[model samples]
Target chain A: GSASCLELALEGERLCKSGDCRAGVSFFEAAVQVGTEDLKTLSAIYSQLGNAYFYLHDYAKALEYHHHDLTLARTIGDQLGEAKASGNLGNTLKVLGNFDEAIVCCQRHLDISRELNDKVGEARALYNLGNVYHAKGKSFGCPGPQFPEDVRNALQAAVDLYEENLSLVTALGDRAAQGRAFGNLGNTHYLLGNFRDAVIAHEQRLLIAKEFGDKAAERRAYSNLGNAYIFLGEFETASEYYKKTLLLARQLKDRAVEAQSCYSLGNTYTLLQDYEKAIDYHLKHLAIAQELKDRIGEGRACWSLGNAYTALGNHDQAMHFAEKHLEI
Target chain B: FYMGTCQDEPEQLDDWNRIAEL
Candidate 1:
């Protein structure tokens, strides 16, 4: 109801930028309520709200707030606000798998960003656009013209954009963004069959993650490394990485990453043809996921365990698990 | 998030493939 509300929004912005987005939410909500009549403050607060929700993986709320931010930006003709709104919406779309619109939205951000010398905004747009193209490349279709032998070009283009992003963030001395650039580079190479390069990029991300004392990023890097090994068919090596992931997740006491590590270990052992070991990890995963009420992870554990049962020549039990998997 | 990890393609599942690549 007053100017003090804008201060709450600013404080929230600081928290979100410092990677405390989950904790920043209440301030954004407060700003939204009390800063109602101030269009500029409203736009800024709405944009930060979108960002906080995005990091919290509440993409539906991110989309809603970003659209509101965009409308308010247009109403106020705040060029920077418009650029940020477009950039955030584009990223949210990319995460949500709306690739076509994702590209369009980032282009809008990039266009305005370059006009205003908003180098940071430009870098963010490029990073998000790279992500959409990477997704397209994985599925064997892209927005631009295609050649018979050029299906992988979309992935290469994504790598190129990520490279550009790395340089931009480095130039800006933004270690967090630079680390993310390497992480995305790892994911792109991981899906594109460049297993060695994928490992290298993920290792780079790991170094940055550790340097920043960001244990969550470290966990992600280890998981990404495990996937590279899995795709490379290095089951033992993959198991080691997954085990490390589980250890660190435990050290961090993060149930989500621990569940993922167990699931990944189950996948690895299944490929190793150690059906018993596979079942061991899968059962652990099911218990944890079930206790956490993570329906998707529980469902995945069911499938893997069912597959393991089939390999063990227990068809009846396999069918039972398969049927139970679908019900979830 | 689990994409392409374990779709039962024999190539991805075969330990022999890792050795062969070596």
Candidate 2:
């Protein structure tokens, strides 16, 4: 039964690799059912299930499994497991729009990693905190009369922490960590209106990812490069990068990347005043986002469709799409 | 974007206090 359990776990992994998430979840459940009452294996299974739910955008279930993993890890004195669960919980909370709680959760992981003197873990927590703060800042309204001081402060703190961790990781000579740090720093700089700096950091990350043959990182780098160019008002350059990002995302079968790239391309077309192309790209984004059940992407795509309709002088259609965007 | 207006006239301290009270 023990060997069978292990085999079941491997089978679950194989199913997950093939993107058969529901089947993978079932196999993982079966494996856990057959395994010995070992906390470590139980925790691992829970974490794997949580990851599957995350990709499926079932954030509530992901949080449930993550919380269960955290409890088991704590009971078994598994520091690494506890840290990972805490980080995953933070990400889930962020996705659920509980930004402050997400910060608290990431901070807890940061405290734990510091206590353990785990530099790698500390860096990861810092990076996660950066992402949470960046998301918060994005939600805080851009080019408005009121600037959110608190959100800005959080973002600044995140940047400092990421940079601090980046230095440590660099000293440790972890190339992979260095790549992640640079990529995250690029995102931070992009948020802070430093397009040139964003480009530099993302370019460095792209070089590292290419050297290591990390396709996921390469896709992200291309996306970031497109974003940086867009911010710099270089729409042509931005579109080219977005095309590259889309190609890579399609090759990797990454739904999130594909949806994001489509959205970005739509945005670029809107900027170029090509309403027909804008509508086409936005519709493409909407289709993929709906298929993936990505609420955020759906909302943005709806908004962009409204903008495209407005450009085409279709006021009623514009308002209709605008209302749909707000409904989400 | 809307900045509310402030009183423009200078006044004695007691007058200023009275105006504030009003």
Candidate 3:
């Protein structure tokens, strides 16, 4: 609304870099509310606003701002802005469960980046596309001829894209980007049931995150480490990593990560045959999923609870949870 | 349009519902 608009937007960027996304939101929100006529600055502000919302895990708001950024950039014929906006929009769409559109957005981003000869942007777009493919491959309810094999193929492509992106980041000395690629590759390898490789990739990611002082990245690395170890049948080791994930998520006040750690803990306890503790952790998972209105998370928790109850021979309770899961 | 609140893919929604049913 005033000359301080840019200042406020800059401050929001600063807060986001510091991983205080909650604190960043107000600054971006204020800038959005304040009128701006400069298309370039306005587009940039919208992009940053989407980023702040992304860090907060408010995908709805993030999509809106990223969409706005895309429109404004297109209006001004700014290919660079379009590339950034499209890449971010693609990511938000992926999280919102729209893989088809997410692919289109990322495809556009990749095309634009290539056309503009921006290697970093091109690599970023590839990374985004890789993530969408990974999520699409991971989503349940897609069984068919060669279904599992097809899923592996999708995941393998994601791994390759991340590697391709990493190659670019390494040449540029972009440690943060390398960490992101490694983390995604680690998850993809985990999905492929390559636990040893997954652990190695996650360990590399953890090292990079720590080296960069990125607490959010560090927290995710810990959670991923838990995931790999869990698959290795290392419950005790997995639980330790989950505990660290939870500890860091709480310190960061990141509700999504906290919920995830709770869900992982629930699974760990189930594997340990500690049904009572499993139920307790799963109830926490359910609460957080409901609080966040995460449909998939809710359904996933209900499925876990149903299975846990069935394991305990609580037929009625198992049926109840199954019904609830199905309802979602 | 891609971010529209109304999902355009009814089949996609139905696919999930069918999975939920079975």
Candidate 4:
């Protein structure tokens, strides 16, 4: 509390940017207690404090700070700050599964951004709205490949929002924003069963990922591409993409994705009638799943191995895998 | 942190206020 509000908030930002969000929170709290006369600075501190809590996965604390920021911004009549605070609150609420409330907050953010003619803020608002709608759509639960009417409508709204975001970011020459838009657009399209559109968006995402040297995004792009190709009934292409996902997942040392890649490859090979390769990849998936103590993944791999062995006319091996699947 | 990563929807964050220039 002895430190200047500006100094304390700046220190908090520095700590958060360096990945010590826990420590960042302490400084931000101190800044709040320092009680700045400058309402704008107070609002900014609250915003950063919210973000610090968000990074630490303390949603309750994040919401509390964001609410404080919003109130301060409104009190100061800072339209831009209010808009930003609304967006932050929307995001936290969305994560908390308060979809309707999140939508209201995001809509306010979007409205204010448009009123201010803030292109970047508008794009960010659109992106946040898209995410909210996407999550809301998935919450409706598709029993199979077919989505319910409400689910379809929610996902379509997400598509429209994401496409708008894409246009804004592309025109703004923000490649990172473009990448994010493309990635989400691809996912939304895939969910809507628009395989070709999904592939196109995912390809753009992959290009940007490579350009930015984002291995994680690249891996995600590969995985999404594989899924799109699979839905398109292009087994060979799907297998190729899955192989890329496998390579990148391993390189990133993400064993969960690695196992998922192996499982996907196994399924693709099975669809291609390559029983030997199917068995090989399923074996790899099983090994990784066991290592990760993932019972569901282990069972899935065993079931796939059984199918592959059965296709190869090895009834004994098939039964063995079937028994293993049952055990899991 | 508005517009951070969602489940598989990986998004970019809004440029936050640093207030360092203040």
Candidate 5:
């Protein structure tokens, strides 16, 4: 809480950047408790604490700390700090399902960034605003192949915001921002049933993601490409992309993504009428789902297996899978 | 049968950008 506050905050930042938010949060907690005389430093500590809590998925703590950051920034007339805090608060609120309030905070961040002529800040604010709208769209109805009118409208709003963000980032020569915008733009286009447009956006995302050598973003790009191609009735291309996703997921040791890739490939093969291949991939999916203890994913795999077996006229196999589905 | 967190999984947004300033 005293002389060591700076050191503690620095250590927290290091740990957080190293992907250990649990330890990061502990250090930030110590720093905040000891406190700092510098208002700006204190505000920065609050922002880091909020961000660490966000990474930990502790939205309540994130909101409280971000609010503290915002209040302190305003008290000190630090417009940039205020804007950043507002964006962070908006993100926390978005996750809390408070769409309207999230929009308000994000809009304030956007306004302030524009007032300050901060292109990077404005781009970030626009991106966050788009995310809030995207979350709002997801909140409006059941998520499936079809979107309701309200859901469509909200997603359309997200598209517009993301487009604005893309333009800003493009002008600023921010490659990372461009990639992110393309990723979201692709997704929103897919949701709107604009499959071709989605493909174009995803390809751009893939290109930049690869250029940056970001394996995680590359995996997401591949996965997204597979999804868009499926709707376009390009099963072979979709399966290829899924295979790439599987490879990347395994390389990254992200079991969740590996399982998802297997599930996607299984479905794609089923569409291609390759029952044996479909069953093989489905079994892999089931095995990984079981390993991960994802009950919902297990049930889904079982259900799909039942369908695949029934299509192959294997009554016994179908019955066995259906039984497993019921048991789960 | 698509396997994604979203129909099109977008990247997470940027966090507070001034971490280096501290």
Candidate 6:
């Protein structure tokens, strides 16, 4: 039974490596049903399943599988696997909005990674910690001494940690991780109001993404660049960048990204006092968000519609949209 | 590929420079 399970799991792993994620998930489910008594095999299978779920954006299921993998790894005294699972679990928690717990999990993972001299794992844990702090800062409005100083302190610590991790990942020539690190640093700088620094960091990431032909990363960098420019009051430039992002997202058939880009472009037009253009973009975004049933995008579109109507001196329309925004 | 200066560009740049000064 164990041998058969192992064979099926290996097949699933191969399929996953070949980019057949759905097929891999089906095969993995079959393997799991076979009941492998081998702890290491089970741990490996669970880790693979966690990775598949992560790709699917099913963070809850990813966390569940990673926890299962962690349990088996600890039982088998597999230190490296345990550490990896801890880091993965931390990432899942971060996505799930459990910032405090995510920080604890990442810190634990970092300790284990350092003990094992696993540089990659250490870098990953630090990066995760950086995200946790960034999320915390965002939650607290990213304020300073007037508010909770710990939030600012945490964000600063996170930036430093990510910088340290970036250096190590760069030395190791890990292009993918380096791209992610640069993107993370860009996000932090963007939140800190360092728009130029954000642009530079995102540009670096965009270059790396282009080198790797990572379309999604490139799109993210473009959107980040657009937002940074918008904050810098470069509305026309922001609109242009947003258009580029929208074009790519449409090409990729990524509805969420297309809607977000449309929303950003609408906001940029509103800032430019082009009320008609703003309404047009917002209406397009609203349609796409409604089609996707994306409540967050829908809420943002409603808010933009309110702003556009206000600028157009349509008080009733503005108030109506404002109420609709709150309802979302 | 396209570059055009906006009337607000200078003010925005000045604001950014002030932030960097901080």
In terms of TM-score, which candidate is stronger, 2 or 5? 5
Q: Which residue pairs clash in candidate 3?
A: A1-A34
- C-alpha lDDT of all candidate models, in order: 0.77, 0.75, 0.78, 0.84, 0.87, 0.77
Q: Candidates sorted by TM-score, descending order?
A: 4, 5, 6, 1, 2, 3
Regions more than 4 Å wrong, model 3: A1-34, A141-150, A213-219, A233-328, B1-22
Docking class of 6: incorrect
Question: Which one wins on DockQ?
Answer: 5
What does candidate 4's lDDT look like per residue over A1-328, in tens digits? 3348788888888888777888888988888887778888888888888888887889899899999999999988999999999999999999999999999999999999999999989999999999999888867654213436878898899999999998898899999888888898888887788889999999999999999999999988988888888888999999999899889888889998888888888888888999899888888888998999988788888778777787788999888888887776
Residue by residue across B1-22, what tens digits does model 5's lDDT show?
6465863444353553444556
lDDT of 1 by residue, B1-22 (tens): 2622311101000011111121
List of clashing residue pairs for candidate 4: none
Q: List the candidates' TM-scores in order.
A: 0.73, 0.66, 0.64, 0.93, 0.93, 0.77
TM of chain B, each: 0.24, 0.25, 0.24, 0.18, 0.19, 0.23
Candidate 3 has an fnat equal to 0.00
Label model 3 with its docking quality class.
Answer: incorrect
Cα error, candidate 4, residue A155 (Å)? 1.3
Q: Which stretches in model 1 have alpha-carbon errors above 4 Å? A: A1-39, A52-61, A74-77, A135-154, A273-279, A293-328, B1-22
Reference contacts preserved by each model: 0.00, 0.00, 0.00, 0.39, 0.50, 0.00
Lowest lDDT sum, 10 consecutive residues, model 6 chain A, at: A138-147
Steric overlap count per candidate: 1, 0, 1, 0, 1, 0
Candidate 5 lDDT for residue A104:
99
5 or 6, greater by lDDT: 5
Which has the better DockQ: candidate 2, or candidate 3? 3
Can you tell me which runs of candidate 2 are displaced by over 4 Å? A1-7, A17-20, A142-146, A213-223, A233-328, B1-22
Order the candidate numbers by lDDT, best to worst: 5, 4, 3, 1, 6, 2
TM-score quality measure for candidate 6? 0.77
Which pairs clash (backbone N, Cα, C closer than 3 Å) in model 6? none
Per-residue accuracy of model 6 over A1-328 as CA lDDT, tens digit each: 9888877887787777777878887788899999688787788788788878877778889899999999998999999878877877887887788888888888888999999998877877787777778767756752321266776676687779889888888888888777877887787777677789888989988999899998878888888888779878888999988898899999999887787777778778877899989898888989998999878777877887887787688999889888888898
- Provide the lDDT at A172 for model 6: 86
Q: Regarding DockQ, does 3 or 5 come out ahead?
A: 5
lDDT of 5 by residue, A1-328 (tens): 4468887888888888888889988988888888889889889989999888887888999899999999999999999999989999998999999999999999999999999999888999999999888888877655534645778888899999999999998899999889888998888888788899988999999999899998888988898889989999999999999999999989999999999999989999999999999999989989998999999999999889888888889999898989888998
